[PDB]
Amino acid sequence: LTLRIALFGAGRIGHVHAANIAANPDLELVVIADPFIEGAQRLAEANGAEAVASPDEVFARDDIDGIVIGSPTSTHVDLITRAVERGIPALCEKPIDLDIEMVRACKEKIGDGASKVMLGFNRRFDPSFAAINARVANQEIGNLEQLVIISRDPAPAPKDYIAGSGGIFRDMTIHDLDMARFFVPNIVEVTATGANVFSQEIAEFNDYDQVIVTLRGSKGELINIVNSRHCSYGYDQRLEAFGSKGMLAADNIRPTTVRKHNAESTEQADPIFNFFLERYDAAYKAELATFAQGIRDGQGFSPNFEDGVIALELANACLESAQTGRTVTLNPA
Amino acid sequence: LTLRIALFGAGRIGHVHAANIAANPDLELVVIADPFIEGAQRLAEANGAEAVASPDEVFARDDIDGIVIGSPTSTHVDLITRAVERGIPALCEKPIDLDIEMVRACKEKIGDGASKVMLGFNRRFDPSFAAINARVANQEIGNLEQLVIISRDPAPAPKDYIAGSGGIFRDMTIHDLDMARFFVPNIVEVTATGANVFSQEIAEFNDYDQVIVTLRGSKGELINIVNSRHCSYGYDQRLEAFGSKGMLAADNIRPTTVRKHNAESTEQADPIFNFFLERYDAAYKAELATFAQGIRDGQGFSPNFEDGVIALELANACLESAQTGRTVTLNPA
Amino acid sequence: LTLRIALFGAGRIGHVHAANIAANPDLELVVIADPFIEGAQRLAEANGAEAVASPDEVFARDDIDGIVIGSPTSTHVDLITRAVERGIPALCEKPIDLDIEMVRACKEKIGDGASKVMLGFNRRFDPSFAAINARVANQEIGNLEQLVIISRDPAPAPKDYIAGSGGIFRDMTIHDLDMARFFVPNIVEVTATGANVFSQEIAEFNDYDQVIVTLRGSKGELINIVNSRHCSYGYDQRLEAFGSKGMLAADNIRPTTVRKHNAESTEQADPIFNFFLERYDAAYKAELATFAQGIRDGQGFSPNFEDGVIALELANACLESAQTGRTVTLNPA
Amino acid sequence: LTLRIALFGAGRIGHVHAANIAANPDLELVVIADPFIEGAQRLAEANGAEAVASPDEVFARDDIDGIVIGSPTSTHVDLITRAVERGIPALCEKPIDLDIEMVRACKEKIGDGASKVMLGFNRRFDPSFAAINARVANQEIGNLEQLVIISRDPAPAPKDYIAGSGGIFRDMTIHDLDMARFFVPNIVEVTATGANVFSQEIAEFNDYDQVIVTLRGSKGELINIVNSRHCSYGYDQRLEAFGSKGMLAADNIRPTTVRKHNAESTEQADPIFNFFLERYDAAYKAELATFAQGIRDGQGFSPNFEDGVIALELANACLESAQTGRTVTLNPA
Ligand code: NA
Ligand code: NA
């Protein structure tokens, strides 16, 4: 039995979900809520659905199950609430808002709506990382002791974006912070170091173009996250899980398996994927297939609204540690 | 203008094409034919299309822009002819036929209509293999001197399939023989060696469960093909191009980039893809897109009918060489 | 042209240096000093040198223009001093002493005669790590921005060694701290995090079995070191240099290049070397050749005494950071 | 009791054995022979041995426990005969002779003296190739079904060397043909194919600069050898053993484990070793030790005289196969 879905937003992120839905049998798109209606009808009219300007138009309906929220990160709150107060399961993108307060206000109002809200942490749904998480849980490498994550964007985003980014910790490291919890949910301490090695731009906005985070798990686990705002070879996304009986790591993905060998060098492979949509193509699809299972059930979604709350809390904690030169205790006593 | 496609065969390959046609935005599947009606109806409704059991019912339509032939080999000459006689382009799974004489007869009846036939040698459309071909053509490694291909199927097909497959050369090596021509169009000599090392079943049909082929190109190029009818770690599909200035080789593909390291061994990766449909997912989609563009251009197809004829002739030359213990010259003096 | 050398100690490290000295055509061992003279006699007799018990006997000689301290830590500060007196070039092993005061006290005595002392930080001489250092210095990857070092010993050392080791930072991490300086000589800040996840024995000795160090270089370089007291697959010794124009990394080393592929896993390689002596065979040899070329030049050494001092200081700095949970500034204002 | 060795040849190969004899604790080099006395003297002097110009001067001594023949092929038969008739064990480099008749003449003359001849097919002693041979023998990958060997020399040897080399099969493939027997002793058929794609010099001497060989084993095993007289990235020496339960392959060797990653390509490794002395360092040393052991045991050597015989008979068969474009049956009925 198929299910209907409503698609908020129509920007870069909106095209992905829309298209993946059509490919999935158990789902069908029907509308798009975006102020820039001209850019909302270049996606709605696309898959065979209608398009509006304001959200209220959609919130003034009565034939939609899933709510794939895909608009700016500072509007999500105002869109998740009105989906909970209508008992319709939703799936959002960037973790709630950038302001922790607004986020808490959202939790309270929706009370336990955090059950009906699956977050868009697509990395958990990547086959490679998901496999490592599952295999680790299956005790394949003994007790998890160390988790190393290396993430480097190809280059800094446009100046305008950096201004409303919320800082590297809230804008970038946050995805890594969530991945950490995916493996070790109970983080007790946060230590972070920030630097400025190449971006003059990022520098004046008093943000970092490079950081390293070390988290402590409730059982002695050390999660080490390395970040950088640029990377000449592509979108570096590695992860290493080290345990008592072995190690599991994920390599980067290249478009082909071709390798060149000549007088200058051997084993020359392609640069790795330079765009997050490419690298995580399968992930978004799997995430959607999971959003479908949680609807056919109703037990709740994972990652949920709460996961996003803590992720942001981890990011702010990282920022405080970086500015203070000391380890931050997440929850005292 | 969306192109209308008729599909023959509701089998496994049929499922791939149907799903790819749906996904392709320039195409639309309007009818599926398969004597096994329930099978066709099942696939048709899953793609919003009609289902018929006979080709007569297909050709009764007057809106067919293109045809995909994914039905049994014994139906290839018939479907190709009917489609071409009606000026309808046809993408046909290899081979044209197992009998070179029937292939010749067909070529005569259709005459110039042969230009509307595209042969489904999907491996040419594999990103990795296609990249290697284009980069070699671009002189990246100088003059091509050797081409080493290693293809090993996971296991022998079912008995009934083996019975009418026409032998390892016409059924399996044929794909490698075409890949060879993709790189070196002009082959002058053929040498082949067959053996029987594990399969009682393959030996029962007077066929080989493993062969080695060495082709001589018009300029001294040596193409070396290695085949086996079983492979414990998956569907082995490697290719190496060696030239005067370097080598380009393609590795196998795995479902994840995960590697395990413990006391037993390091760099442990997943077994490689086991099914052709998975290994060549991208290839089939790229092949379909090329078919669509050929329908729009009317400028012909590649691989073409002729590539299908020569591929079979090379396979026949292989069998003859293997049975005689000598090299076979394709074009006498 | 040759140079006489005198080794102190006949333990594991002693054997290694002796053979290397004999191996190097420009050198030749003459005597070995060790309180367990029985072995000293045995070993020497296998090279072509005499055997004594205490340093006094070695100091009752007048034919020593090369010194090597393979003897235990307790005798390091002792021999270095008693050797600079006669002004003879020397090469000591691991850390001058675990006690920084003793080091300062030693530095205060030899005063300027520290320029003749070389430190046995063999890793700097490994062909792989050294190549990376030199290539980075040659601007091959632009400006160095990140350095990630992952070291993991196969298993903990005997209970007695752990008791008198001086902690993971002084005993293990110190090698990585020097490697960090080999790349970024100037370190401004230190941050360390320790934990206990598997060794009860290490826990009762108030030591850590896991630690993560992040050092801030004078120009914003972030150096990230990861350590662990056990490793199921071998002696993990990886290093990664990340710059503005690329990245250089070193893999672990295996005894053979054999790879196995089957139904369980593909690309299975051998477990990596599990003994530091095997892994750094080439390093120790290069370390010696550099020592010799230094003596046959009288231009000092590298690594030198000052490097060992700073190394212990970083170690102590790390410990200080781990216990307080705060970043430590090496030189205030 | 240190065995005394006499070395014939002060050239490239002679230099390697000499250095290894010195290094080896169970051996002592007492005399080197070479018509070019200056080289023999120069080398001997660097090994505390004596230098003479003729074999007579070597056989005038009565203390020789073993002989190593590293002199030109034209002297192999003479030196093997003289040594064996005097009861002296002899390790001889590839080819007893290039002429199978002279080889047979030698065998007829020395009779049971052949048991004192070890053939220097050093590749069997490579740790990697040897490990694979042993693991296959231990049934690790089931029944051996295919063996693929790819050998590419960095470049053609000097003209004069090529002039008296006896062709690519006798000079180059012979090592691969021996490797084949190391895995499958019983070969029943030979098929070979040669081409001329780059070297005017090789074509000038009616030789091939490129060959592909396929051997049939007594149980249907297929051994496939690929050769080329040039290779831009180094000395390509790969081997792949494919069995019913898996596969074992050996990768090429590089000087370091360094890999570069930038905008052009990722995983860039060093060019592989370009000199056989570098690639087979461990093998030559292991081969010498095996020679030393055989001298003490008196049980015989492996590879033995017959291996040298059959390896040549196989090379001749390959040439005959290539010239006639027909498969050759090794043992007619
Ligand atoms: Na479509
Ligand atoms: Na020796």
- For residue C118, list its beta bridge partners: C91, C304
The verdict on A113 and A159 lying in the same domain is no
As a whole number of angstroms, the distance between CA D148 and CA B47 comes to 46
DSSP letters of B198-259?
Answer: S-HHHHHTT--SEEEEEEEETTS-EEEEEEES--TTS-EEEEEEEETTEEEEE----SS-EE
As a whole number of angstroms, the distance between CA A294 and CA A306 comes to 16
Contact state of D145 with B226 under an 8 Å Cβ cutoff:
no
Is the distance from CB of D261 to CB of C246 less than 8 angstroms? Answer: yes
The verdict on B176 and B295 lying in the same domain is yes
Query: Distance, CA B6 to ligand 1 centroid (Å)?
Result: 12
Amino acid at residue number C30: V
Written as six digits, the tokens of B10 are: 């509701």
Closest CA to D154 of D279, D251, D276, D274: D274
The verdict on C78 and C147 lying in the same domain is no
The verdict on B254 and B320 lying in the same domain is yes
As a whole number of angstroms, the distance between CA B4 and CA B26 comes to 9
Residue with tokens 């640029």: A230
As a whole number of angstroms, the distance between CA C294 and CA C312 comes to 24
Show Cβ contacts of residue B33 under 8 Å, excluding neighbours closer than 6 positions.
Answer: B6, B7, B8, B9, B40, B51, B52, B53, B54, B55, B57, B58, B71
Report the alpha-carbon angle D75-D81-D84, nearest 5: 130
Show Cβ contacts of residue C264 under 8 Å, excluding neighbours closer than 6 positions.
Answer: B271
Cis before A303 (ω within 30): yes
Report the alpha-carbon angle B307-B311-B315, nearest 5: 175
d(CA C254, nearest CA chain A) in Å = 16
- Domain containing C310 — which CATH number? 3.30.360.10
Q: For this experimental structure, what is the resolution in angstroms?
A: 2.3
Closest CA to A23 of A292, A319, A300, A224: A292
Residue with tokens 């490079």: A210
- Among C232, C252, C268, beta carbon nearest to B268: C268
Report the alpha-carbon angle A239-C252-A255, nearest 5: 45
Closest CA to A98 of A317, A315, A323, A324: A315
Residue with tokens 């300007």: A53
H or E stretch covering C276: helix C276-279
Contact state of A256 with B141 under an 8 Å Cβ cutoff:
no
In chain B, where do the E strands start and end? Answer: 3-8, 27-33, 50-52, 66-69, 90-92, 117-119, 144-152, 187-195, 210-217, 222-228, 236-243, 246-250, 258-261, 268-269, 328-329
CA distances C76 to A279, C70, C119, C144, C165, Å, are 54, 9, 11, 35, 15
Residue with tokens 């920022």: A319
The verdict on B269 and B298 lying in the same domain is yes
The verdict on B227 and B301 lying in the same domain is yes
Residue-number span of the structural domain to which A199 is assigned: 121-333
Name the H helices within D93-157. Answer: 100-110, 127-137
The verdict on C24 and C135 lying in the same domain is no
Q: Of chain B residues 116-155, which have a CB less than 8 A from chain A?
A: 127-128, 131-132, 135, 140-141
Query: Is C200 an 8 Å CB contact of chain D?
Result: no
Read off φ and ψ for residue C138, nearest 5 degrees: -90, 15
Closest CA to D217 of D151, D149, D144: D144
Question: From edge to edge, which strands make up the β-sheet containing A210-217?
Answer: A328-329, A187-195, A210-217, A222-228, A144-152, A236-243, A246-250, B258-261, B268-269
Count CB neighbours of C130 within 10 A: 19
Is the distance from CB of B3 to CB of B295 less than 8 angstroms? Answer: yes
Contact state of D222 with B230 under an 8 Å Cβ cutoff:
no
Closest CA to A114 of A314, A301, A310: A301
As a residue count, chain B comes to 333
CA distances D114 to B135, C16, D120, D254, D284, Å, are 53, 41, 14, 38, 22
- For residue A202, list its beta bridge partners: none
As a whole number of angstroms, the distance between CA D114 and CA B118 comes to 64
Is the distance from CB of D196 to CB of B220 less than 8 angstroms? Answer: yes
Amino acid at residue number A106: C
H or E stretch covering D273: none
Written as six digits, the tokens of B106 are: 């067909």
Contact state of B250 with A261 under an 8 Å Cβ cutoff:
no
In three-state secondary structure terms, B283 is helix
Read off φ and ψ for residue D3, nearest 5 degrees: -75, 145
Say how many domains are in chain C. 2
Contact state of B260 with A140 under an 8 Å Cβ cutoff:
yes
Amino acid at residue number D58: V
As a whole number of angstroms, the distance between CA B305 and CA B90 comes to 10
d(CA A47, nearest CA chain C) in Å = 41
For residue B274, count CB atoms less than 10 angstroms from its CB and return exposed for 0-12, middle for 13-18, buried for 19 or more.
middle
Is the distance from CB of C226 to CB of C207 less than 8 angstroms? Answer: no
User: Of C76, C94, C120, which residue is a domain's last?
Assistant: C120
Contact state of A247 with B256 under an 8 Å Cβ cutoff:
no
The verdict on D63 and D126 lying in the same domain is no
The verdict on D1 and D62 lying in the same domain is yes
Which subunits have 3 or more CB–CB pairs within 8 Å of chain A? B, C, D
- Domain containing C22 — which CATH number? 3.40.50.720
Written as six digits, the tokens of A211 are: 């950081």
The verdict on C135 and C256 lying in the same domain is yes
As a whole number of angstroms, the distance between CA C99 and CA C77 comes to 10
Show Cβ contacts of residue D150 under 8 Å, excluding neighbours closer than 6 positions.
Answer: B148, D225, D226, D236, D237, D238, D239
Amino acid at residue number C310: I
As a whole number of angstroms, the distance between CA D190 and CA D315 comes to 9
Query: Is C265 an 8 Å CB contact of chain D?
Result: no
* For D274, nearest residue in chain A (alpha carbons): A263
The verdict on A54 and A112 lying in the same domain is yes
Contact state of B132 with A258 under an 8 Å Cβ cutoff:
yes
The verdict on C165 and C45 lying in the same domain is no
As a whole number of angstroms, the distance between CA C207 and CA C204 comes to 8
Query: Is B256 an 8 Å CB contact of chain A?
Result: yes
As a whole number of angstroms, the distance between CA D263 and CA D265 comes to 6
First-to-last C-alpha distance (Å) of chain A: 49
DSSP letters of D215-270?
Answer: EEETTS-EEEEEEES--TTS-EEEEEEEETTEEEEE----S--EEEESSS-BSEEP
d(CA A137, nearest CA chain C) in Å = 17
As a whole number of angstroms, the distance between CA B30 and CA C51 comes to 94
Written as six digits, the tokens of C275 are: 């003994």
Contact state of D266 with A260 under an 8 Å Cβ cutoff:
no
Residues of A in contact with D266 (CB under 8 A): 233-234, 252, 254, 268-272
Residue with tokens 């032998």: B167
Closest CA to B21 of B1, B41, B39, B4: B4
Is the distance from CB of D223 to CB of D203 less than 8 angstroms? Answer: no
User: Of A99, A120, A141, which residue is a domain's last?
Assistant: A120
Which subunits have 3 or more CB–CB pairs within 8 Å of chain C? A, B, D
Query: Which residues line ion ligand 2, judged by CB < 5 Å?
Result: D 22, 24, 27
d(CA D267, nearest CA chain A) in Å = 6
d(CA B136, nearest CA chain C) in Å = 26
User: Of A101, A120, A139, which residue is a domain's last?
Assistant: A120
Query: b/e for C24-37, b at 16 or more Cβ within 10 A?
Result: beebbbbbbbbeeb
As a whole number of angstroms, the distance between CA C203 and CA C163 comes to 11
